């Protein structure tokens, strides 16, 4: 089996991406963030506080005739952003592009924090990380991607992120008419549940490649890119006025600029960032000073390939026995 679906941004700066997903009978639809950070399927719902949902869809557990109360299990997770949710947990049937998968583990919400009831935008999360950080207790759950894995053609699935535009997850094919070039594949650690992988460099615009090591996670889940500060610091020292601010969070430059691309490695091969994908638009409506794509990670443990990176490339998740990772232009 095989399964294909659009994944549309949520806004005009990409700040995430949404895909449709099916779950339950009659199905009911819900936009949902593929967060390959993570490993818990959980959706608004009609448990969720009502004072914590504006706007959202909510599944409804007791319309669908194929759900099923997992009984005693809950769940409870935090993200890197500082966001959480938690709740209890039903089994159904989730359809993704085409692609279904029976017995389910759909978290339902009964508390998320203020970031989730701003953004009508969002559903709920999809995980796509390694099953082993799911937060389901007493019993571990699986993720859709674990519990298609068998019957798809190919125990794969692609992300196709859009600059600006629709892009496409697809699950059990690699579709060879949406990269240029080859797919060079990169060894993964699956030691801290991610799409860990090690990039060999970076090149700053027209700079000259610099090789050097940098481990850090495939993130569809994290909008920008955290890089180490000596990396970060390089790339911002090309864009005139640039500056980190610690008031704002991170670094700022004027909104006038035309930024430098930012080059990263994978393998032998390089996947170039224009630019422009690199802003982020003003800190504030009106103001002049515009936000960047590519921050330090310093702060956080872990450097992310999140959005800005993956956007520029045709991405593999290779779930084989022993996983990789695929980059390819495109």
């Known amino acids: 089996?095989?399964?294909?679906?659009?994944?549309?941004?949520?806004?005009?700066?990409?700040?995430?991406?949404?895909?449709?997903?099916?779950?339950?009978?009659?199905?009911?639809?819900?936009?949902?963030?593929?967060?390959?950070?993570?490993?818990?399927?959980?959706?608004?719902?009609?448990?969720?506080?009502?004072?914590?949902?504006?706007?959202?869809?909510?599944?409804?557990?007791?319309?669908?005739?194929?759900?099923?109360?997992?009984?005693?299990?809950?769940?409870?997770?935090?993200?890197?952003?500082?966001?959480?949710?938690?709740?209890?947990?039903?089994?159904?049937?989730?359809?993704?592009?085409?692609?279904?998968?029976?017995?389910?583990?759909?978290?339902?919400?009964?508390?998320?924090?203020?970031?989730?009831?701003?953004?009508?935008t969002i559903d709920g999360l999809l995980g796509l990380a390694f099953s082993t950080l799911n937060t389901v207790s007493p019993t571990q759950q699986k993720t859709f991607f674990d519990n298609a894995k068998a019957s798809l053609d190919s125990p794969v699935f692609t992300a196709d992120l859009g600059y600006h535009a629709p892009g496409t997850y697809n699950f059990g094919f690699i579709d060879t008419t949406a990269y240029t070039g080859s797919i060079t594949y990169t060894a993964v650690s699956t030691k801290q549940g991610f799409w860990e992988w090690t990039s060999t460099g970076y090149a700053v615009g027209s700079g000259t490649f610099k090789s050097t090591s940098i481990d850090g996670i495939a993130d569809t889940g994290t909008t920008l890119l955290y890089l180490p500060a000596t990396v970060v610091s390089a790339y911002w020292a090309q864009v005139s006025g640039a500056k980190s601010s610690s008031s704002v969070g991170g670094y700022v430059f004027p909104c006038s600029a035309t930024l430098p691309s930012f080059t990263f490695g994978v393998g032998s091969a390089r996947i170039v960032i224009p630019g422009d994908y690199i802003d982020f638009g003003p800190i504030s409506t009106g103001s002049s000073s515009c936000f960047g794509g590519i921050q330090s990670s310093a702060g956080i443990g872990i450097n992310i390939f999140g959005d800005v990176a993956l956007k520029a490339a045709f991405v593999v998740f290779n779930g084989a026995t022993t996983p990789t990772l695929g980059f390819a232009s495109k």
Request: a negative charge.
């Open 1 to 120: 089996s095989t399964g294909s679906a659009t994944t549309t941004p949520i806004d005009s700066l990409d700040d995430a991406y949404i895909t449709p997903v099916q779950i339950g009978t009659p199905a009911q639809t819900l936009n949902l963030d593929f967060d390959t950070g993570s490993s818990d399927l959980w959706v608004f719902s009609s448990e969720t506080t009502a004072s914590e949902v504006d706007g959202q869809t909510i599944y409804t557990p007791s319309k669908s005739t194929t759900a099923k109360l997992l009984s005693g299990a809950t769940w409870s997770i935090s993200y890197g952003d500082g966001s959480s949710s938690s709740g209890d947990v039903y089994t159904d049937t989730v359809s993704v592009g085409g692609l279904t998968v029976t017995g389910q583990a759909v978290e339902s919400a009964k508390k998320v924090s203020s970031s989730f009831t701003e953004d009508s």
